[PDB]
Amino acid sequence: GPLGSGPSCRFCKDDENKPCRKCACHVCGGREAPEKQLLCDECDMAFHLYCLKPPLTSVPPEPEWYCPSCRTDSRREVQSAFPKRRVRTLLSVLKDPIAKMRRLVRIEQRQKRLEGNEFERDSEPF
Length: 126
Ligand SMILES: [Zn+2]
Ligand SMILES: [Zn+2]
Ligand SMILES: [Zn+2]
Description:
- The protein is mainly alpha-helical.
- The chain has helices spanning 68-72, 90-93, 97-114, and strands spanning 37-39, 46-48.
- Helices cover 21% and strands 5% of the residues.
- The longest helix is centred in the last third of the chain and has 18 residues, at 97-114.
- It comes from Mus musculus.
- This is E3 ubiquitin-protein ligase UHRF1.
């Protein structure tokens, strides 16, 4: 059967007016509540509080959060005992048109340049 076409994003290229796994929820590939999704700290990808995890329905109080694969893949060894900040969320990013476009262009370029690195990987783009 035929494939979809339209104005294309640069990490999923499906449609800029539609939700994706990297534009919206990485776990359902959609958007419904843009005020109940978490962001990784390595990928900055969205994750519904009710798609990403079965137990809790609310965002943690801690200083950093990465996707459940990244958090299992030894990126940090332990939970934090000091509240330096709270984790990143769409209720913060998606609730601002600049934080939206910054996470969608600025972050997408951060990872997409690393996927085809022109120099050593410690290039400090952020
Ligand atoms: Zn996309
Ligand atoms: Zn979802
Ligand atoms: Zn991640």
